Design a protein around this ligand. Structure first.
Ligand SMILES: COc1ccc(N)cc1-c1cnc(N)c(C(=O)c2cccnc2)n1
Length: 342
């Protein structure tokens, strides 16, 4: 009939009303986002005199506990990321308000998907992509801090916001799926398009799964379309094999879900199970980026900083991020030393 004395709807969300004033501080403007966790609203903090994004967690134990995990990680990064120099969204504050946990973040701009949609999904320049690549590798280096060792676990263009629509700075948001390194508890993780092979294959994983997501994300930012846009896990792996080929046998010989996608023939080698797709490794990233044809779709012909030399340095870094072996995959410190950033 009525939930939380009328403050919540039937699925535990707080009914947001534009113009409401919380605790004589926050002036709720409008709803800017929704999710399984709850809602995100645009509000004006009057003590600090600034716009803020408030994350109102649903009035439900499951989502309340998931948010305290998120708060513990965010505050743990504030102890290390003083002055906010590592491109992580800053948690300012949190409080309870009418049985909902509220998290106050800095008011950020559009996400990288919004930006891509406004190119009609054909990408931004390689010079801007380099600016995002350097900032993302730097944030991943921060999460790699030994005392942190944080896996974001859901990197994707929507989880990366611009600070100011007039500036090329980006921030990583939404650490509700995030966990610190440790013994394996979850296996169905990451967004599918950006899910690493060790996750698809049911193998142990570490912080290197975020480096895989980045490689897919960076290519997507320049071409406009997801690199591996699988409609399911079988389709996903098949689109990975198109570009990178069959994974190594010493990995597949260990993968618990190897046979969900592959088959071992009598001769001891692995091949794709029949389900369409190009032969393994013939959708070359060289051609996807259009290294020698003027970029994706030839749309970058004649633009400065889009030479074959530049594309070859971008391709090399990406291929280091899309390494099948998570122990060989490039690490943030090394990625930042790459020639693509000189
Ligand atoms: C345009 O910005 C958004 C659009 C949709 C949604 N759902 C959220 C945002 C947005 C804007 N500013 C923010 N600071 C944030 C977040 O900090 C954020 C995003 C996802 C999950 N938790 C916090 N999120």
């Amino acid at each position: 009939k009525v939930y939380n004395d009328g403050y919540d709807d039937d699925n535990y969300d707080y009914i947001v009303k534009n113009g409401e004033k919380w605790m004589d501080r926050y002036e709720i403007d409008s709803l800017i986002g929704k999710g399984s966790f709850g809602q995100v609203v645009k509000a004006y903090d009057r003590v600090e005199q600034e716009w803020v994004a408030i994350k109102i967690i649903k009035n439900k134990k499951a989502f309340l506990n998931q948010a305290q995990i998120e708060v513990r990680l965010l505050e743990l990064m504030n102890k290390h990321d003083t002055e906010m120099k590592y491109y992580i969204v800053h948690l300012k504050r949190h409080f309870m308000f009418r049985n909902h946990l509220c998290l106050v973040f800095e008011m950020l701009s559009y996400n990288l998907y919004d930006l891509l949609r406004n190119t009609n999904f054909r990408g931004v320049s390689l010079n801007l992509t380099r600016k995002f690549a350097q900032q993302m590798c730097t944030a991943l280096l921060f999460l790699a801090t030994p005392e942190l060792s944080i896996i974001h676990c859901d990197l994707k263009p929507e989880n990366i916001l611009l600070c100011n629509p007039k500036r090329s700075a980006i921030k990583i948001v939404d650490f509700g799926s995030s966990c610190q390194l440790g013994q394996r508890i979850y296996q169905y993780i990451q967004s599918r398009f950006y899910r690493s092979p060790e996750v698809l294959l049911g193998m142990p994983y570490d912080l290197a799964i975020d480096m895989w997501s980045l490689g897919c994300i960076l290519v997507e930012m320049h071409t406009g379309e997801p690199l591996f846009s699988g409609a399911n896990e079988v389709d996903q792996m098949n689109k990975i094999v198109e570009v990178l080929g069959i994974p190594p046998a010493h990995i597949l010989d260990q993968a618990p879900k190897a046979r969900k996608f592959f088959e071992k023939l009598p001769d001891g080698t692995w091949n794709l199970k029949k389900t369409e797709y190009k032969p393994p490794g013939t959708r070359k990233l060289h051609n996807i980026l259009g290294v020698e044809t003027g970029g994706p779709g030839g749309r970058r012909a004649g633009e400065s900083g889009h030479t074959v030399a530049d594309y070859l340095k971008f391709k090399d870094l990406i291929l280091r991020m899309l390494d099948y072996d998570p122990k060989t995959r490039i690490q943030p410190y090394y990625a930042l030393q790459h020639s693509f950033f000189k």
